[model samples]
Target chain A: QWQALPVLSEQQSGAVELILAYAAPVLDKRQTSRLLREVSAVYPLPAQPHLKRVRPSRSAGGAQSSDLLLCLAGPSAGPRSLAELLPRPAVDPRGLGTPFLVPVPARPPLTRSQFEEARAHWPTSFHAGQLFSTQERAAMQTHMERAVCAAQRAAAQGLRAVGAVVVDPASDRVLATGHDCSSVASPLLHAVMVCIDLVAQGQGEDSLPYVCTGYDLYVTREPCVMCAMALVHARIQRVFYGAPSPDGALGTLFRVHARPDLNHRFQVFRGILEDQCRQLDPDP
Target chain B: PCVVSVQETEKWMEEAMRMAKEALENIEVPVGCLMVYNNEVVGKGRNEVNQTKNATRHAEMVAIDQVLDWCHQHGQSPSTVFEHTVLYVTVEPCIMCAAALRLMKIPLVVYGCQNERFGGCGSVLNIASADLPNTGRPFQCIPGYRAEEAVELLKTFYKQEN
Candidate 1:
């Protein structure tokens, strides 16, 4: 599926961590509500509401009354701040016991599996399964095919048979389309560069910070390092191309998008409409 | 936790398969679909292309039409409706039906089998997610929810036909 994109999909998982939180025991169910109410008055009680705020209160002998997982205890809310706050009857309430630091997953689960993993320590909420879908396969096919036509037009003009099309995925509207015009235009006006400039100017001048966020770019050939880096600066969503450029930055010369050093990254898919895209290349 | 559980997903796929069986009885393709909202099977349909002599009457297409009508009767329109909705189907939708699903802005699609030959989801054409620069919204899809059952059902149909 990486060769193309799914229509809708799960987010790529990131780092996970267990954060600190304050916990205490409630003498009865009544105290559970009141304890939450009192602590909430001073500082918010719930952080990861998906995990149960109340559990079977632990004891040295075995399970005692219901234990309440109180507010956070980490840097977000240090233990001293939560500890100093009074509940009702001076330091402690009538039914609520003393507070202690406990560990909990910092974030709520995104999927059922994550929920179950977290559930090993605490009763967690159920999460729906993640879905992955993309229109990129077809979109790539459509745009690459159009790019091939543009490349042919460029070839007819005695220029490099390369072309590019920039489109807004949200509206499926073509922001700009261009072919290489190094000879007719400037040497710097490669197909991708031309399209990027057109997109920047097409939207308006006030839009100086040209961010191609959620926008898809299609090209007949893999772009050189220069064009690829410009794509990085533009913050394009995904790039699809037909033929691989051996000297290209995306995969051959450098996998620029995959590099960790860069702050921005976009998805790159190649060989979309390979046969047609490669057909007119003079190098081959 | 509005997210349906894995168990709940299995249950919905079973209901979709039941409709596929109904399609088989009607001498249509053994494909079925169920549109779910708020954990309820709000709309459902079986493949009716052969029975109705309409190429457009795929299980997904039929079910989508039903969902539209459901929205209307409930004082809802297409734009305002379908929040947290899911579409479950026996087979992956074809291109036409896949495009229809995208146009409708269906949030999720759960499928039993991949229609590799003509499937618009990801198998053959990928029209379902084929972001063709349209106003239609993209949807999340989970394939092979009950793949064995759907594969067997299609196999049963082919054997009967042959």
Candidate 2:
């Protein structure tokens, strides 16, 4: 046993290093996904129109617990109101600006032809919405539903899971948000587009600034490079995605967007899916 | 081939026991000991069997917890403290114990044995340590103790109906 020990040691060390390397990336992904999921739970979508402070009470032992404060502002409240409502230390007070608000304009209802055309772009088995007469609510609802469905399908397919959030550009209020799960799937592109279109169509000229200010989209899979390019073309500013195409598809896609600012603002975080679902797995 | 002959095993046991005794004499109690078997902290001043399983369990917990506590007080990770620390144990750690050490990512574990049998209660150390990678696995062996004698001693303290 003694004579053979040296050989064994060498073999074991080599094996362990390999295991650690493979496991490290997976572990990192799992952690990020979990953090995003937990944050989502704390900050749910379709944000309410109100400002409320939630503080953690100190323990008798004199240890101060962490504090979580949720601030929701209404349409009437201007950008200045946000400064007072949000936790100043946690957020950039000056960063709160008009671009974050929901745009104001009367939107024209979507025609059946346009809706059908949009629907054709998504995966099969999508949910339908009310026709043009009630386009605003229908479009928003469709976007949310599709996002939920897409997220669920991704998880079921062993792809990364993600959530979709839609904020009203005019009010800075979260209009809709959803998480994809086995039971609750993600929304399809068509659905997400409808939600964006509703906000875009309703605001009309105001939509330019609102869309230009850009919103965030977190997906389990890499964003369609073409879709990313389109977002850039529309002058959308920041995009935070949870996964990048393993094959570098999105990088090529961003190049097509032709906007240096968009390229700079786009961020793709990889391997976050496993981290999000680590606790759910049987083995750590 | 008998890589470890009966005579060699006996000698190894004696060496293990002597080392364990020396370790106990020199070991400093840590504030929090992370059990190398499970990576959980052993509560201070608690008896091992009363708290969890066998004697080794208690000793291992106590030993690691004390070391970990010392690490924390000095503002360091276990790996940092392990560079200068010496671990002493009364019995070999089991698979669970070994797993604990790995989980904490501890660099070394050293212990003495209470018996010679491979699967006896004391055999835990060898088994647990064996699973670790060669570089990270524990350095352990038996002291000068007979398995039968230890078993008899165990029997006297704790009754087993079966």
Candidate 3:
């Protein structure tokens, strides 16, 4: 049981669970024990990690046990009624003698770095970008660069200069690539549409029944409404784009992928290689 | 409470784009915003972060302030007026501006391009959406009005700087 588990990759970062905790500061062991007993009688304390339930409160002069935090209840209990559980301090030794809310990880931190980072922002919400690692970002850039090259290939053919690449990040394989062929094909052949056709045709009879499910789609510019709808039907997991499209649907023209009314949804990341994508534009 | 038609939305978006270009001329971030009430444009603003040297002086914030001022001058309550108003912005509102819009209770929002870095609408954070905590219900959003033009203006400005 003492054996350590395998190290987690950046992809596992989303698994971290953060919950809003209700805690109050007490002066000494006497107050800590009494408050815990009284609060537990009124509200059921969650069976959380001991480290999460009790932590050494930050003090200005650096003395341990001078101020202690007792995590009494979760957000379910009213803060006002919880404060009523505490014995009123005579004139208050410090201003932190009241119940307050703090955001804490629901589980014990797995890694040393995660522990340090969690301690730094104990009460505040962490930004979503901070969860991603350098390697994750580098991989996104690589995919965007590939999409940019496909766009250039379309431009050389005197097309609309839009391109899309379907990638299976799990397998690290480029499933299919497509460029706008509206001039050559019919009006329905946008970059994503063409790419979807290629992906569908590339697979054999033994391939999974659902095509492009959980696959990432990288495009040079935002896809239009029709292309966006195609993505929804294809069940793409995520989308990454270089330049914004005024009439495109992913985020610029509309958030079709993020529409709550839809049965399926995908996260979108944009501006991967915005300058390069825009430079492909012949006009000012 | 009614949605603005596509033609009307595009007309206001063009005016917002013009204000964004004015910001570009002033060497500021090319973000612009306009507020409309009863189908009439009442407030206009362009990013003045460079000239004002204040980080919070975003185009949307400036437009919201101007709208409040207009209400003050006209003896109307912004609390009720904003519920019937519409906001047109060249770029997606950031978290701060989005929060302000929620607080002001702007019923509808029309914008050009999405901001990936700090867009608090549906782009990155989705603060404008109804599911987020304490942000209240989602308002109607008509995006991508002249979005190609919006992306072009942003590219032109950044191209000159870099």
Chain A, candidate 1, TM-score of: 0.53
Best by TM-score: 3
Better of 1 and 2 by lDDT: 1
The candidate, 2 or 3, that scores higher on lDDT is 3
TM-score of chain B of each: 0.90, 0.46, 0.90
Off by over 4 Å in 1: A1-284, B1-7
DockQ of each candidate relative to the true complex: 0.01, 0.01, 0.01
Mark the 10 consecutive residues where model 1 chain A has the least summed lDDT.
Answer: A1-10
Residue A6 of model 3 has an lDDT of 17
Q: Give lDDT tens digits, candidate 2, residues A1-284.
A: 00000111111213211000000011122234443334335444333212112223457998553222222334454543434544434443332222233211111113333334333321111124332135443443444344445566555765434445555345546544444321111112322232343344444432222343454443333333323433433344333333334322233222322223222233332233333322221100
- The order by descending TM-score is 3, 1, 2
TM-score for each predicted model, relative to the true structure: 0.36, 0.25, 0.44
The lDDT for every candidate, in the order shown, is 0.67, 0.34, 0.65
lDDT string for model 1 (B1-162, tens) is 126623388788888889998888877779988888777776889987555433345787678767767876777665555556788899987644665566567777889897754566777455566544432566778888889888888887878873
Which fraction of the native contacts appears in each prediction? 0.00, 0.00, 0.00
Best by DockQ: 3
Better-scoring candidate (TM-score), 1 or 2: 1
Question: How many residue pairs clash in each candidate at the backbone level?
Answer: 11, 53, 3
